[PDB]
Amino acid sequence: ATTTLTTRIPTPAIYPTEDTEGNKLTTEYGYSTFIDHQRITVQEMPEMAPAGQLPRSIDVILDDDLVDKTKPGDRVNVVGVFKSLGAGGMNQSNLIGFKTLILGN
């Protein structure tokens, strides 16, 4: 869900513990490739806030790059796409609506 902006058809592929022919396998950890995932939650800046009210906050997901350049308590501007992903309620069974977040670009 977080690698393309368009809702690509899901592909729940299965981690291969056996070959197509049926043989055993072992894992070449570090010929495999990895990427950092992080989410950071941003709440409204308290001096612009209409004071007295509660804080309100939303979840930002960062790919490999920007992971190193946020820390809690700093004033931060983000830009991204406010995706509304999953299918809560209308699929599966039951209310609370869709999971809303920003893809931080």
Helical (H) or strand (E) element with 85: strand 84-85
* Spatial distance between the Cα atoms of 81 and 104, rounded to a whole number of angstroms: 7
Q: Is 21 helix (H, G, I), strand (E, B) or coil?
A: coil
Query: Judged by CB, which is closer to other proteins: 5, or 25?
Result: 5
Contacting positions for other proteins (CB under 8 A): 1-2, 5-7, 9-10, 28-37, 39, 53-54, 56, 61, 71, 83-85, 87, 89-92, 94-100
Q: Are the C-beta atoms of residues 66 and 104 closer than 8 Å to each other?
A: yes
Query: Judged by CB, which is closer to other proteins: 79, or 87?
Result: 87
Give least dist CB 75 to other proteins, A: 14
